[PDB]
DNA sequence: TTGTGGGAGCTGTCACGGATGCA
DNA sequence: TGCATCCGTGAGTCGAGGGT
RNA sequence: CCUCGA
């Protein structure tokens, strides 16, 4: 009811400004208070007609300031969030050097065990499928080879190169 | 003024405290005694003012 | 949710705002932080076509306030008089009944100056709507809500950076830039100087083809979490840039308005939303420009977006001009003797 | 969400220039 | 509308280690 | 941020 914002707007606003000095006596940051006078101004609004007129509202209102604060405060301080050293050019990437990536992207003296040991049937078909990880139909697309061709060189390029 | 605020005072072209103003033009000098403060005024040799 | 300026051009001396519209930074500062009203648009032709039939009504209302001052004023003089009549009848201490009398003379002269008063709120409301004009500001509360309560479809009034944003629009640039060069080419002293300040920045929106409106802004850009890192702490602990808690104020303001916006809120309510949320968006930007700084833990400010730059700790000091390399090493120095040059 | 309940913590800095704001 | 005031600049470089 | 080195 329309009569309900106005009742609202009259005799609780000059409460607003008394309680902010209360939410700064609970949250010691001004920035953190107005957020919650804020915060309670919504759910006092929201359900203002459950308050009976001619009551206290300023014990009323209080109450949900200080209920919003609490459970504010568990919810936010489950997880303890503090701040980065004064300098943020010392928080470590986490990649890998240049020199790191290049022994890393390379192989061992094993590359000459699978190039020419094995036959190029299987060299070409145990390199792309293990590499890349294409599908079993996509190796059987770059050879022109079913799968009978493709799960088969395979299967024996591993049991090749388990030797040596 | 002093020695390395006196550069920075160049450098930066800024009045200088302890101001000693110039000559605007060739002319004949009155300076005024005076115990507290002084004053000048020049009369231009070119028929000036 | 609703518009916010740039602090950049607000608050940075000189107020590029200040010189556009040409207004005081203390009234910008009191209009986009919601302390004063400011008149938008103006209907000029509707206000002229019903100026006599508002004139007409506004001496009604004048002519009755005063015969209701000539009406209260007489019955407590008529009282006053039989009040004393009936102490002159009796044993009436003079000094007493001088009190009586001053106690009454007292009773008409509050009568009279609260009449005054209302007859002097009347006047300034009707002077003040007869000389209505965009950008002018409205201080009183109780003037702007009786300006809109009669004569309220005459013209537009609004608060925030929403009205500076709708003066920038029914702004012409060309008819200021035009007239600043014609002030100070016919004219000389402190007003030529203003008008050059002025007309630097004015003839620099105008030759670009920069639309000024971009000194308002209605979506805030996000950096990339990169260049805000959030890493994982020795145990359940977390360090995040301070970007982050700026970020999540604007953000949790901005959803706070939304939630006001929706559930029709009261004016004064949302007006506090707006204004939280103008100024936690100058604390992202360029924190304690304005005001005190917004403070972490500890009391400790937070480093805005404009801090990233500025000081020797700056990206340009700290990162172009000048930076770490490879292939480089360190160590205490001895003197070799048998060295060569 | 009813009957009470308004803050920390700072200044012990210096020199300069120009927009701001008031007389 | 003429300044006095207030507000906003700037104040060396490179290193080591330890903390939130 | 603090303490230290040139």
Redesign the pocket.
Known sequence: DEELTARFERDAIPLL??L???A??MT?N?ADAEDLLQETMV??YA?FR???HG??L???L???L???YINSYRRRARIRM??????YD?VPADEPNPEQIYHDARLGPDLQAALQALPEEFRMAVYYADVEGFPYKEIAEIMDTPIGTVMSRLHRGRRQLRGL | TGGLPRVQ?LF?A??P?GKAPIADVTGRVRLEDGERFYKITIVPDDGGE | AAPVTHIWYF?????RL??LLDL???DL?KIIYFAAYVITSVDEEMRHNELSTLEAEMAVERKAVEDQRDGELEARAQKLEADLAELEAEGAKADARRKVRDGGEREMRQIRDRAQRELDRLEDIWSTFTKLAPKQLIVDENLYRELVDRYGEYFTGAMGAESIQKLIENFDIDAEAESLRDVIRNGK??KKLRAL?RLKVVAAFQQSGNSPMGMVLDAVPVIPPELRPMVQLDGGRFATSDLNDLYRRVINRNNRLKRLIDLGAPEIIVNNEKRMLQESVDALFDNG??GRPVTGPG?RPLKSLSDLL???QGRF?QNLL?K?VDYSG?SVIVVGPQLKL
């Open positions: 400004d008394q902010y000095g209360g700064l006596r010691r001004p759910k006092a359900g459950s308050f009976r009551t206290n300023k014990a009323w209080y109450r949900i200080t209920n919003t503090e701040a980065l050293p004064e300098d010392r | 005072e930066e800024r009045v405290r | 608050k940075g001396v000189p107020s200040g010189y005081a930074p203390k500062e002293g402190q300040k420009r304005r009391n500025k000081g020797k000091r000048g770490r360190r």
